[PDB]
Short mmCIF file of C-alpha atoms in Angstrom, two decimals:
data_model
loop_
_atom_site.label_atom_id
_atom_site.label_comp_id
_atom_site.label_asym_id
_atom_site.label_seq_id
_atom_site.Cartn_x
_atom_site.Cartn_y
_atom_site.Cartn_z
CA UNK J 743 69.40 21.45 78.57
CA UNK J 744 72.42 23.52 77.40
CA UNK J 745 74.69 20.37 76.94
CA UNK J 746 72.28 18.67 75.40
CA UNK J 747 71.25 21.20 72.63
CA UNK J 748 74.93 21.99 72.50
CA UNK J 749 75.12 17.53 71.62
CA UNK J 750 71.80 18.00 69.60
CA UNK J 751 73.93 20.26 67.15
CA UNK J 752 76.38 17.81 65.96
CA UNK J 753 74.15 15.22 64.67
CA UNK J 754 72.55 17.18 61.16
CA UNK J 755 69.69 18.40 59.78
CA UNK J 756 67.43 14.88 61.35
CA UNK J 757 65.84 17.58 63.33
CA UNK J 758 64.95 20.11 60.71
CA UNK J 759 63.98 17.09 58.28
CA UNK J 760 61.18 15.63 60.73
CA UNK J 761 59.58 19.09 61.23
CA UNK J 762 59.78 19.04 57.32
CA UNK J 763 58.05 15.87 56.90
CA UNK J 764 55.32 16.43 59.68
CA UNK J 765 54.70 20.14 58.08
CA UNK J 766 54.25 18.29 54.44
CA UNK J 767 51.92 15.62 56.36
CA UNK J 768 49.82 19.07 58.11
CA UNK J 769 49.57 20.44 54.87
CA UNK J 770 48.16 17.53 53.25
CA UNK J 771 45.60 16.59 55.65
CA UNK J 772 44.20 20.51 54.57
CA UNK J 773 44.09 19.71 51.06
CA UNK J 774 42.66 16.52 51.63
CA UNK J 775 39.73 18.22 53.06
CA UNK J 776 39.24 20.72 50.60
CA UNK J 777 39.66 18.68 47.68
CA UNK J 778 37.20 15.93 49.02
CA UNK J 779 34.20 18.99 50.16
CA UNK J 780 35.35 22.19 48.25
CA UNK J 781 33.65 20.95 44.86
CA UNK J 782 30.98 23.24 44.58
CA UNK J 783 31.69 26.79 43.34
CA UNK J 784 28.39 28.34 45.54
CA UNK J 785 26.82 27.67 48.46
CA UNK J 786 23.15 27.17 47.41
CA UNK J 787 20.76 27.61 50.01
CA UNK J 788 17.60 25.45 50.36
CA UNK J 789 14.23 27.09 49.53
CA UNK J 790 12.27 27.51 53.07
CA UNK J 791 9.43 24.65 51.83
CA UNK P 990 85.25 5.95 62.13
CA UNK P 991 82.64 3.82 63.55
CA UNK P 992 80.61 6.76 64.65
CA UNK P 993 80.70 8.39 61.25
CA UNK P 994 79.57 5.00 59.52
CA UNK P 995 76.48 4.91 61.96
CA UNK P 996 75.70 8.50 61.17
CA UNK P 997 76.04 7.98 57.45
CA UNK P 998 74.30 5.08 57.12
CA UNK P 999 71.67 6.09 59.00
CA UNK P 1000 71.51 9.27 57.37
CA UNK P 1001 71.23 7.33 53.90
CA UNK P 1002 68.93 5.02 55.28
CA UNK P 1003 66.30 8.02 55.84
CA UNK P 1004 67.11 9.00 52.38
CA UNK P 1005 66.01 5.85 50.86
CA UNK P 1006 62.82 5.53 52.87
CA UNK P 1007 61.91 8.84 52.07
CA UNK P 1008 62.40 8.09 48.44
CA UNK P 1009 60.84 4.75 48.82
CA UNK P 1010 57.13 6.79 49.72
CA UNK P 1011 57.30 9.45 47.16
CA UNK P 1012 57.91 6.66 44.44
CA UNK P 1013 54.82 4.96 46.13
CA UNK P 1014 53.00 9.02 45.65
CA UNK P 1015 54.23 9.92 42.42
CA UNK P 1016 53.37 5.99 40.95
CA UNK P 1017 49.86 6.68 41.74
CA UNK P 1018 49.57 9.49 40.13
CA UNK P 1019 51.25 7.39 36.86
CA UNK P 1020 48.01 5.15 37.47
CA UNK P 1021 46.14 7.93 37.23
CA UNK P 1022 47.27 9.68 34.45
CA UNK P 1023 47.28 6.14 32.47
CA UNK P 1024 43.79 5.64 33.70
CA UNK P 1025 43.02 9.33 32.39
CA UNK P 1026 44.66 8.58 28.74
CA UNK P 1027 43.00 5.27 28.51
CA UNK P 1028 39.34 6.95 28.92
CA UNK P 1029 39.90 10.98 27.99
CA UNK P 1030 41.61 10.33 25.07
CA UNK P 1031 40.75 7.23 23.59
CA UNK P 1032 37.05 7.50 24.30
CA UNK P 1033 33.72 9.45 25.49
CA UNK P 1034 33.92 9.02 29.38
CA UNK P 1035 30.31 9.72 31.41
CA UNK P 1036 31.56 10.09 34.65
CA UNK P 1037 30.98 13.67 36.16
CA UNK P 1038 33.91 15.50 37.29
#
């Protein structure tokens, strides 16, 4: 809504500052992962026996 | 003025909580780094990684 986005724009940066925080918090989940299984520097493969 | 005191204070409000988290992040990473100097420096550690 045109009225309400024209509304939306008097109240700050709230709405930039979220998408901030949730795009820190998407990032992080990322690194999480990679830091907890990304230890190894090769991917060894098992010997077929 | 009472609209401007809502929006300030609630704008300050997000401040602190915001600050209140990363002192919670950046504290464990004091632990850490205490944890690290009590065992790295002050000792022979065996634990891998």
């Amino acid at each position: 809504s045109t009225e309400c986005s024209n509304l939306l724009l008097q109240y700050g940066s709230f709405c930039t500052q979220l998408k901030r925080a949730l795009t820190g918090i998407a990032v992080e989940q990322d690194k999480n992962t990679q830091e907890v299984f990304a230890q190894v520097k090769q991917i060894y493969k098992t010997p077929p026996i | 003025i009472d609209r401007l005191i809502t929006g300030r204070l609630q704008s300050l409000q997000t401040y602190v909580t915001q600050q209140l988290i990363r002192a919670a992040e950046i504290r464990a990473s004091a632990n850490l780094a205490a944890t690290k100097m009590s065992e790295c420096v002050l000792g022979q550690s065996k634990r891998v990684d």
